[model samples]
Target: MEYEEITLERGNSGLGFSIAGGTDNPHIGDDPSIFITKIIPGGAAAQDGRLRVNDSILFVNEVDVREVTHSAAVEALKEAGSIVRLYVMRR
Candidate 1:
């Protein structure tokens, strides 16, 4: 797998996905920073179907979210505008 850039619009389901993992968390691994744990059903991301669970998000919009906390990444996505640029890392 490799790193790539993709785009998707913000859908009805908040951010269209669920985020899991991050750095500096005793509960999780540092290397799995901010991965997509799930996609909102019937949402834009779900319908797009290219993105899926275990896909790591290196950035939200343009903000670097990798190595940050889970909450940190969550907030970044929540604050993003209509069109979102996803920096995805696959491994």
Candidate 2:
């Protein structure tokens, strides 16, 4: 992967995060990568200490996520184990 790797455990409920700013984002139409839009306070991603807003997701597990749709990326994350590894490029 062309990014840093991070492993995160999901909360009992979900991944505890949200993302936006992909290739389709009308605001910053530069990169085709998905960015971390929000991290639920005290949640899995929030507690990870590495993930942050604007961090671009490059892979889920060992699968490439670049240029994928938001839903596709989300599905990949969901399919990964409760403990998912995310490869990200910091922006």
How many residue pairs clash in each candidate at the backbone level?
0, 0
lDDT of 2 by residue, 47-67 (tens): 887676666788888777677
User: For model 1, how does the per-residue alpha-carbon lDDT over 40-66 read when each residue is reduced to its tens digit?
Assistant: 878767766667777777887879975
Q: Ten consecutive residues with minimal summed lDDT in candidate 1?
A: 23-32
Full-model lDDT, candidate 2: 0.71
Model 2, runs deviating above 4 Å: 23-27
CA lDDT, every prediction? 0.70, 0.71
Candidate 1: which stretches are off by over 4 Å? 24-32
Give per-model TM-scores. Answer: 0.79, 0.79
Clashing pairs in 1: none
